[PDB]
Ligand binder design. Sequence first.
Ligand code: HEM
Ligand code: HEM
Ligand SMILES: NC(=[NH2+])NCCC[C@H](N)C(=O)O
Ligand SMILES: NC(=[NH2+])NCCC[C@H](N)C(=O)O
Ligand SMILES: [Zn+2]
Lengths: 414, 416
Amino acid sequence: KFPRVKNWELGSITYDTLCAQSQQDGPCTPRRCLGSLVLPRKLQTRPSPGPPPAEQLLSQARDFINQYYSSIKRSGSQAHEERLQEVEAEVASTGTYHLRESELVFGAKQAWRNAPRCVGRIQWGKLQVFDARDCSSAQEMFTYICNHIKYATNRGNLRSAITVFPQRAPGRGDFRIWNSQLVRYAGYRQQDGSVRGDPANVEITELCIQHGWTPGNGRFDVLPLLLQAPDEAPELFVLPPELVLEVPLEHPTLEWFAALGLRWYALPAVSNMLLEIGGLEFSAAPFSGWYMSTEIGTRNLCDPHRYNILEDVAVCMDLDTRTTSSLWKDKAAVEINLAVLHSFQLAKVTIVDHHAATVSFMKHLDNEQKARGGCPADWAWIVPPISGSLTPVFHQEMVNYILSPAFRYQPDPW
Amino acid sequence: GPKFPRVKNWELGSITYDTLCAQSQQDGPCTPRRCLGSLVLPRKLQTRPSPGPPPAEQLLSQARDFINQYYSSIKRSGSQAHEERLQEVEAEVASTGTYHLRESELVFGAKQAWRNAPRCVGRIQWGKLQVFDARDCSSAQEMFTYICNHIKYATNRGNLRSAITVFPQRAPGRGDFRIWNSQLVRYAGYRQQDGSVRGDPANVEITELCIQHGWTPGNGRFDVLPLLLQAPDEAPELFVLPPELVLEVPLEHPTLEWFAALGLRWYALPAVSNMLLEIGGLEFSAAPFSGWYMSTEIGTRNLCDPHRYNILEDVAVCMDLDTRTTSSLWKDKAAVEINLAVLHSFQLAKVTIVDHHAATVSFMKHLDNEQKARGGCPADWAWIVPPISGSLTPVFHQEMVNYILSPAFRYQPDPW
Ligand code: HEM
Ligand code: HEM
Ligand SMILES: NC(=[NH2+])NCCC[C@H](N)C(=O)O
Ligand SMILES: NC(=[NH2+])NCCC[C@H](N)C(=O)O
Ligand SMILES: [Zn+2]
């Protein structure tokens, strides 16, 4: 029934009882485990042209409202009872309902708290929630997004935030941010199939050009936003350069590193995920925190299908790239990550290294064990892409399951 | 599309479907409700000592399954030899409750077990395993002889050869043949007065057991442990491996001249000895196997895990790194040098070893071979991706499907 979770570094054991509260199924079965898969095969988020079964929505709604009143220690109170009645009344008559701002704020924080792949959840309680449901056009979306960025960036002293646009509605198109992140570097396919810039952003870069954007020709050209109001073609918006904080990359002791002309933006803001609260779905709810150095130094800069700078750095370090056994890749990666940390610290921009991050996550696991009897966590995503076993989370067994409120993937709007 | 798991490789953007998982007849620990894939020891395979004879009906089906696998492998499925072998197995079980494997069947089953091991990154070599049949072994002393021969053949003066030695299978009511040590070669772990451990903390229990059994302990950081070998229904007997048989490699760094002064070392032969080999229902409680090391096993896990030798800080201090702050990446820097030292020293001593880059590239080739040969390959992502430089290797970007296929190697309870 309840899984026994062990930490092999400390010898300690715990029992996850929270997983029982899971109402949504993952991709695994007793026959085979598909935990290493990035996206769901079916756990997607099918269209919403028709209203969801009132019974199902109503049960998810009640559960959420129940969750909310427990949080404010007012369960069973008169307000709790009236709120449930309001929800019942609205669903029965319209097939849907609406959240109160306070509930939305509670729901957003819970979704982050329940995100199995986020290593920064110890900060889950300090989330600035912007209510953007009052939005009715792509232009208005652009204004909200610009305010989110200004606030979140805060001159380098990053602050976690989320902006919530209008929920999905039956038979009506969704509000969507076509970009996967609010700030991304263009990826231009060139003559021989190669790519200048970020290979991960080729498709979105092309859509922007298709929709009237005048493309640059650099390796780090910040893309424009393609914002979509319900049932309307997406509109193009260029972000004001002064709002997009960037950090030039240099190395503490390797003078030549800066000559590589590398840089990265300060604000990591996922904008293509769906936020689900009490059965309601928010198709556009960009959120941001701050980077963990391995995301830039290891994945973005060193992944083979990304900037893939490992070899260049290796050669500048005059390493023996003749054989794998010289561990030249491992050596270059460490320096690149060091350069990232050094640079962000120099530019006074918030950033956390993987050691500090994983240590904070272990604390979070403990806090959650006492507060809720468990913590859904995805081991493959929590453990850093380098020096895995050198961090504490590597030696910690984890249970992964889906709790709601939750952040989920959704189909690309095109 | 296809009604099987869709597996993607994000580096190459290629896709494959695993149809082999359809052949799994043993449930894992996961459910649609929650994933328990990270658990090291999930109460699943766990071959708990099953005294009373196994349900003849369950054993038979497992036996028939294996014989079918065997005859399919030699392309004679449906043949007269196949149906007669099936009749012979069912008959033997009918009158005795169990059955026995032909030599070639044992060889086939042992290789399939390795091939089927989800956590092994060295499976591209699966077909070249040397299977030593020791099913005639009748004493703990004889177990020692067999083990010494295995160690000698496998070590082969540094040019290691994969091998497995299979002792008699489990029998009803009769005690099991067991090797108490977790590996044929392990360093002692001595509990200290202040509560610390000198040597390898992972072997404190086995070390204490060896002592309780007459072993006169040493006081070093790398004392090779003796073997506690147990024949059916007898207390375990203690055997000391002749030093000349245990090849070790002193560790030195290619450029950091002081590293050699650290006095670190490791043995060349990795030989797991506490796992159970299950073939067609039959259980081989004692069947030690060995290959060769992947450098991160020694350099990162054994030497740097907090609960093992934990030498990260010592080396960082020697490298004069800032160990007072995480952002200096002192742990990362020291780990890399320790791993390089391991590769350098083994190469120097001409002892077989494979670095994590070479190993993972070879495992990718293995996955492709297996996709064509069986429609998939059971792999445990968390165990396949190396403990350092994870995303710098190709396997990190390869999604994997984990499941249990038989023949298989399984964990079994400690005999004490
Ligand atoms: C405050 C600093 C934060 C840090 C250091 C952090 C770090 C991380 C990391 C390392 C990942 C995995 C990234 C990857 O491998 O692509 C992740 C994933 C995630 N984070 Fe956070 N996070 C932070 C804030 C937030 C906030 C504010 C939210 C939401 C309100 C959030 C929601 C998520 C979600 C839902 C995922 C999974 C995204 C996916 O599946 O691609 N995180 N986070
Ligand atoms: C030829 C060289 C070989 C290499 C490089 C190799 C490498 C590895 C590695 C790195 C692991 C995980 C180690 C750990 O984290 O503890 C492993 C696990 C395993 N290997 Fe291999 N292996 C080799 C040969 C063999 C052989 C010959 C067999 C069996 C006939 C085998 C069976 C297994 C099994 C069953 C496991 C999992 C044991 C456990 O769960 O602790 N390997 N191997
Ligand atoms: N620390 C974060 N909030 N990360 C969000 C995901 C960022 C993504 N991994 C990137 O490299 O851009
Ligand atoms: N390469 C191998 N055959 N490894 C088997 C496991 C050895 C174990 N990881 C050790 O470091 O002792
Ligand atoms: Zn699973």
